Amino acid sequence: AKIVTDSVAYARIILTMGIRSKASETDLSEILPEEIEERVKTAAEVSMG
Amino acid sequence: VASMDWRKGQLRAELFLNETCHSATYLQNEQYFAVAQKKYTFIYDHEGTELHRLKQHIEARHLDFLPYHYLLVTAGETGWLKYHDVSTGQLVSELRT
Amino acid sequence: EKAKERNPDEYYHAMHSRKTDAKGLLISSRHGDEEDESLSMDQVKLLKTQ
Amino acid sequence: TPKRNKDNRNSRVKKRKKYQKAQKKLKSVRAVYSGGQSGVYEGEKTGIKKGLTRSVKFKN
Amino acid sequence: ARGGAKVVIEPHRHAGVYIARGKEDLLVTKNMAPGESVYGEKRISVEEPVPPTKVEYRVWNPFRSKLAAGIMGGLDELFIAPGKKVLYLGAASGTSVSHVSDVVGPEGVVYAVEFSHRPGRELISMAKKRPNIIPIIEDARHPQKYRMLIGMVDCVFADVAQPDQARIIALNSHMFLKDQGGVVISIKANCIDSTVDAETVFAREVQKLREERIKPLEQLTLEPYERDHCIVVGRYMRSGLK
Amino acid sequence: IISGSDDGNVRLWRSKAWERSNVKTTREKNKLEYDEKLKERFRHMPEIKRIS
Amino acid sequence: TRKFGLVKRTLNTKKDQRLKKNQENTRNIPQVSSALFFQYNQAIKPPYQVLIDTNFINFSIQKKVDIVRGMMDCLLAKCNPLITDCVMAELEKLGPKYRIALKLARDPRIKRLSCSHKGTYADDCLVHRVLQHKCYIVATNDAGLKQRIRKIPGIPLMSVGGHAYVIEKLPDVF
Amino acid sequence: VRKLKHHEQKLLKKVDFLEWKQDQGHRDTQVMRTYHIQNREDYHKYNRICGDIRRLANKLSLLPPTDPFRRKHEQLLLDKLYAMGVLTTKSKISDLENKVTVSAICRRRLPVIMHRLKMAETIQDAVKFIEQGHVRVGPNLINDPAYLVTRNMEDYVTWVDNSKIKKTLLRYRNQIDDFDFS
Amino acid sequence: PIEYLLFEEPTGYAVFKVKLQQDDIGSRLKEVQEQINDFGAFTKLIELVSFAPFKGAAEALENANDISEGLVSESLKAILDLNLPKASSKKKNITLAISDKNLGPSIKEEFPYVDCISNELAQDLIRGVRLHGEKLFKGLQSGDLERAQLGLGHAYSRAKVKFSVQ
Amino acid sequence: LPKPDDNMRREVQRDLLLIKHRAALDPKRHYKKQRWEVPERFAIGTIIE
Amino acid sequence: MFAKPFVGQLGYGHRDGVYAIAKNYGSLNKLATGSADGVIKYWNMSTREEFV
């Protein structure tokens, strides 16, 4: 909620990834810029929720 | 008398002293330096301000410094050689030559 | 007592800006500001437009 | 006799009014506690000072 | 007040605490999560203009949270800071740990410690909406059991009502508080030794804190908000208390 | 050095009164050492002896 | 195009920061105790803790009265004495001629408590503990410290004279 | 210079590059700044005379008190200094050793005496007006600001004629009689 | 003798060499109590030897839970047995400092030649490990601790409070 | 807190002057004696429920 | 200027004057004191508090 603040860039992650374990182990880089994409990969690795 | 920084082009202190200046020297660093006027030896800072008017050293034609004792020496047209401590202000010795 | 002891050679550096009436007593403007003595033509042109 | 009052004629009435006058002085000297909230209101009503510091100092 | 009253927010001398000046003055702090009151207290909204933002301010209830009673009492320097970290003890609900989270900002975090699972479920639910709060359901008397989760807090605040308040604060401050860090303890005289009076309890507990190398700086009775209480604010010296 | 008393007190003391209980950095350890060995050979002029 | 009235630049002796003596460059009101009336201090209830100085100790030896059961006669209620670490340090700094009064001071029935001062003054410590709490009762037998504690309200003081003690500010004298 | 720490400050209690014992508390630059004298040796040139007054002060007092040679002498010197203006008291004679001061002798200089007659805005702006050639003592203007004005001569210091320093003064009063081209 | 000490980071365990012992007679003094504040003085006392990070957040939760019950985990047993020299279980056991006094019998049951020390001396050193933290590990840390403390923080809090997202 | 500019001035100084002289708005209030100069950083908000 | 030999006393001490002290030869942190009351106390000087 605090790294990708765009409304539809958030939503299309949810259509693609469902679990934070799924987001770390599989592809997301199509719909994100790479410096943001690598940093949500750290977010999918260690997180809060 | 100009407290000249030399390798770079800066000038720390420029002074126009209307008495006949004879000899000036840095004493402990580049900051504090002491000039010798017509009748009295003055001591200056990096900004060109006066610090003390030395009541002794009543003639200073040749003024030198030796660094490991903080010792300001003066001997001019007067026969006397006066040793002065720039660390404490005590005139250490007054030799009548 | 201050009247008899004027010493008519004094200068304070506000003798330029402060004016005096022809009768003898000093004058002070109603606005009191040092900027609203009058109005320039660019101000008058804009203020009449408003 | 100089004209005294009905208050001095009884000690029990005098001790009551002397105590209630001393109680209102005590509320003026220090902020004593009174009740809590049986109603709705949240904070205070007499203003909040900034540089007040009504705390005793623990000097060594 | 009502839904049409207006106030002027002026910053209090303590940083992070703000003052709402109206017809009556109020003690207010800027909220983390807007729109929802953590325990039903009222809240103030301002708008600042770039497109505008609507940041919401939340009032601090003095009679339910003992820290707010001490602020309007007036302290020399409450060590809870706009940037530092704070170790709460005894935060059952968010009666005050929401506002302590509000005064330390997003840069600092707040470590809420409580025992019972019934208010710890509420402490879980709030700490996932204010990201600076993390809760400790682990027992506060034994800091060894939760030493994984806390690293070098800067402030410790006591609100637990066990009679061994001096032992439970020293055992936390010896291992989690930084040097020269602030120690705030809300001393309750009924919960420590009810057989003896209030000032005897206050003299005893500030002496036990001096024995455990916690120098006291100030005490405040907070009388008009709560009977028979005190807060003792002091600095953890640990090296030459004299 | 632990010292008793007739006053009922058991005081504990230092061996050398100028040293400290710290662990020092290698710069401070050398310079404190250098103050000691230079003091050892230069004991014999009387104004080192006057202060010591 | 020079300026006018040129003067030699010198040392601005009341202004510069290179001197030692020009290196210099929240209202406080301590509240009254909430357990204190005008003059009562209603928190004075049994048991009691007395603060002891040397002039209390040395006169009690002079007047043949031991502390714990001697405190029983005047104050008449249950009370235990406590002596600060500062006081016992300076009481035993009197030396050899009061060591019997030293021995009566160190006793398992006389409680002791620690201290935090960069000093050993008995009068300054006893007042500061009194100011910060208004909880204790003080035993003193010199006029300098007695007037210092008589000027703070609500603090019971006791002294010794004749054969036994005498309390001053306690309402429950009997 | 480094705001030296305690373990070396006790070793260096007596060091100061800025303040020395021969510098007599910096009373030279203190009375120099207050009264705005230009060069550096002018304070000490007064101090030799102010020391010489005190030298004749003490040497008058080893004499017997009821000496007829004494009875004439210091009253002659007191009237000399009163007409000088350096001391402004005829009653005491102990003032001729105590109240005789360089600050007593430098307030009788010209630019201070402007400020006592309120003819200048400050004590420094008098030096500016004296050096620009505006100030006369009787017939002639003097340009040296280091002029001691006699107590009698204090009455006659005006502005010079036909000058712009006088025209502004008379224009505010609406008094300019330009037949005398003032 | 406090020859080895142990700190347990939120991501992994660590075993530290103690090169110098602060003198424990004057352990309440002004000088030695502030000597852990300076990183230039604490690093003469301590030096890293081993640091085995936790393989995942799920492994980090149960390992932190096993410490909370006062039991030695598998990863703690693995990192200690392969760092402590095999000393005697009868004479002059190797001294290892643990922040928990309760973990003493659990370690010595598994490792009979190692003794657990939790004094004021041991607690002051382990507090100094927290005080410097990331500086002492020479960058070996698997991830930032400032998220690792928070990540394990809600893991242990939610599991002990026993609630579900359903 | 954001700085007060010299705009929206008619709606702010009326509130500031009323808060500064709030001791006479109601004869039955009697606030603490204080000064309350207009602060150099402040803001305006309304209480909502 | 750094000669500060007193560094602290142990506990509250005994009550008549210790006439026998024995340091622990195998451990750095312990000693035993006994005074004229026939009371013996075991001291940890790390905390400067008696065990028992």
Burial of K3 (0-12, 13-18, 19+ CB in 10 A): exposed
Burial G50-63 (b: 16+ CB within 10 A, else e): bbbbbbbbbbbeee
Q: Residue G28 is nearest to which of D25, D30, D53, comparing CB atoms?
A: D53
| E75 contacts D53 by C-beta, under 8 angstroms | yes
Instruction: Kindly report the number of other CB atoms within 10 A of residue B83's CB atom.
Output: 18
Closest-CA residue in chain I for E127?
Answer: I154
For residues G110 and G93, what is the distance between their CA atoms, to the nearest angstrom? 19
Instruction: Enter the tokens of residue C28.
Output: 């002070």
Contact (CB<8Å) J45/E45: yes
Burial of G103 (0-12, 13-18, 19+ CB in 10 A): middle
Contact (CB<8Å) E175/I154: no
Q: Which residues of C touch H173 (CB under 8 A)?
A: 20
Instruction: Tell whether G152 lies on the interface with E, counting CB pairs under 8 A.
Output: no
Instruction: Enter the tokens of residue E50.
Output: 């770039």
Interface test with E, best of G50, G83, G114, G135 (most E CBs within 10 A): G135
Task: Write the secondary structure of E60-107 as one string of H (helix), E (strand) and C (coil).
Answer: CCCCCCHHHHHHHHCCCCCCCCCCCCEEEECCCCCCCHHHHHHHHCCC
Where do the H-state alpha helices sit in H40-181?
42-59, 68-84, 102-106, 110-116, 125-131, 164-173
Amino acid identity for residue G10 in this structure: T
Spatial CA neighbour of B27 closest among B36, B18, B17: B36
The SS3 of residue I124 is helix
Task: Write the secondary structure of chain G as one string of H (helix), E (strand) and C (coil).
Answer: CCCCCCCCCCCCCCCCCCCCCCCCCCCCCCCCCCCCCCCCCCCCCCCEEEEECHHHHHHHHHCCCCHHHHHHHHHCCCEEEEEEHHHHHHHCCCCHHHHHHHHHHCCCCCEEECCCCCCCCHHHHHHHHHHHHCCCEEECCCHHHHHHHHCCCCCCEEEEECCEEEECCCCCCC
Upstream peptide bond of G47 is cis (omega within 30 degrees of 0): yes
Instruction: Tell whether A48 lies on the interface with I, counting CB pairs under 8 A.
Output: yes
Q: Can you state the angle between helices E97-104 and E117-127, rounded to 10 degrees?
A: 30
Instruction: Tell whether K46 lies on the interface with I, counting CB pairs under 8 A.
Output: yes
Contact (CB<8Å) I145/E128: no
Instruction: Enter the tokens of residue G133.
Output: 């709490």
Determine which helix (DSSP H) or strand (DSSP E) holds A21, and give its type and residue range.
helix A20-25
Q: Which residues of K touch G104 (CB under 8 A)?
A: none
Q: How was this structure determined?
A: cryo-EM
Instruction: Enter the tokens of residue H176.
Output: 């300019």
- Tally F–K CB contacts below 8 A: 58
| B78 contacts B70 by C-beta, under 8 angstroms | no
For residues E110 and E134, what is the distance between their CA atoms, to the nearest angstrom? 7
Instruction: Kindly report the number of other CB atoms within 10 A of residue G141's CB atom.
Output: 20
User: Which chains have 3+ CB pairs within 8 A of H?
Assistant: B, C, G, K
For residues E53 and B81, what is the distance between their CA atoms, to the nearest angstrom? 79
Contact (CB<8Å) H16/G20: yes
Handedness of CA C26, C30, C33, C34 (dihedral sign): negative
Interface test with G, best of E196, E200, E222 (most G CBs within 10 A): E200
Resolution in A: 4.0
CA distance readout (Å), I60 to I9, I56, I140, I162: 10, 6, 17, 18
Contact (CB<8Å) H18/G10: no
Q: Which residues of G touch H3 (CB under 8 A)?
A: 23
The SS3 of residue I7 is strand
Interface test with H, best of B32, B53, B85 (most H CBs within 10 A): B53
Tell me the nearest-neighbour CA distance from G4 into chain H, angstroms: 6
Spatial CA neighbour of C9 closest among J43, H137, F21: H137
Contact (CB<8Å) E223/D30: yes
Closest-CA residue in chain K for G115?
Answer: K12
Q: Residue H121 is nearest to which of C12, C16, C18, comparing CB atoms?
A: C12
Instruction: Tell whether E131 lies on the interface with A, counting CB pairs under 8 A.
Output: yes
CA distance readout (Å), G32 to D56, E63, G36, G38, G129: 9, 21, 7, 10, 14
Q: Which residues of C touch H171 (CB under 8 A)?
A: 15
Strand order in the sheet with I46-52: I46-52, I13-18, I4-8, I94-97, I114-117
Instruction: Tell whether K32 lies on the interface with F, counting CB pairs under 8 A.
Output: no
Closest-CA residue in chain K for I22?
Answer: K46
Instruction: Enter the tokens of residue B91.
Output: 């005139």
For residues A32 and E213, what is the distance between their CA atoms, to the nearest angstrom? 54
Determine which helix (DSSP H) or strand (DSSP E) holds C17, and give its type and residue range.
none
Amino acid identity for residue E96 in this structure: S
Q: Which residues of G touch D54 (CB under 8 A)?
A: 29-31
The contacts found for B7-15 with CB under 8 angstroms, 24 or more apart, are: B12/B46, B12/B47, B12/B48, B13/B44, B13/B45, B13/B46, B13/B47, B13/B48, B14/B48, B15/B44, B15/B48
For residues E60 and E43, what is the distance between their CA atoms, to the nearest angstrom? 9
Contact (CB<8Å) A48/I150: yes
Instruction: Report the length, in residues, of chain D.
Output: 60
User: DSSP string covering H54-85, please?
Assistant: HHHHHHTTSS-TT-HHHHHHHHHHHHHHHHHT
Chains F and K lie in contact, requiring 3 or more CB pairs less than 8 Å apart = yes
Chains I and K lie in contact, requiring 3 or more CB pairs less than 8 Å apart = yes
Closest-CA residue in chain G for D29?
Answer: G32
The SS3 of residue A27 is coil
Tell me the nearest-neighbour CA distance from J8 into chain E, angstroms: 13
For residues E242 and G116, what is the distance between their CA atoms, to the nearest angstrom? 5
Spatial CA neighbour of K10 closest among K36, K33, K27, K28: K33
Instruction: Enter the tokens of residue E27.
Output: 């003690």
| H145 contacts H133 by C-beta, under 8 angstroms | no
For residues G130 and E207, what is the distance between their CA atoms, to the nearest angstrom? 13
Determine which helix (DSSP H) or strand (DSSP E) holds J48, and give its type and residue range.
strand J43-48
Burial of B36 (0-12, 13-18, 19+ CB in 10 A): buried
For residues G45 and G77, what is the distance between their CA atoms, to the nearest angstrom? 9
Chains I and G lie in contact, requiring 3 or more CB pairs less than 8 Å apart = no
CA angle A22, A25, A27 (to 5 degrees): 85
| E90 contacts E158 by C-beta, under 8 angstroms | yes
| E133 contacts E125 by C-beta, under 8 angstroms | no
CA distance readout (Å), I65 to A49, E117, H21, I25: 19, 17, 74, 36
Phi, psi of E57 (to 5 degrees): -115, 145
Chains K and D lie in contact, requiring 3 or more CB pairs less than 8 Å apart = no
User: DSSP string covering chain E, please?
Assistant: --TT-EEEEEE-SSTT-EEEESSSEEEEEE-SSTT--SSS--EEE--B----B--EEEE--TTT-HHHHHHHH--S-----SSS-EEEE---SSSSHHHHHHHHTTTS-EEEE---HHHHHHHHHHHTTSTTEEEE-S-TT-GGGGTTT---EEEEEE----S-HHHHHHHHHTTTEEEEEEEEEEEEHHHH-TTS-HHHHHHHHHHHHHHTT-EEEEEE--TTTSSSEEEEEEEE--S---
Residues whose CB falls within 8 Å of the CB of residue H133, separated by 6 or more in sequence, listed in order = H141, H143, H160
For residues I83 and I95, what is the distance between their CA atoms, to the nearest angstrom? 13
Amino acid identity for residue G135 in this structure: C
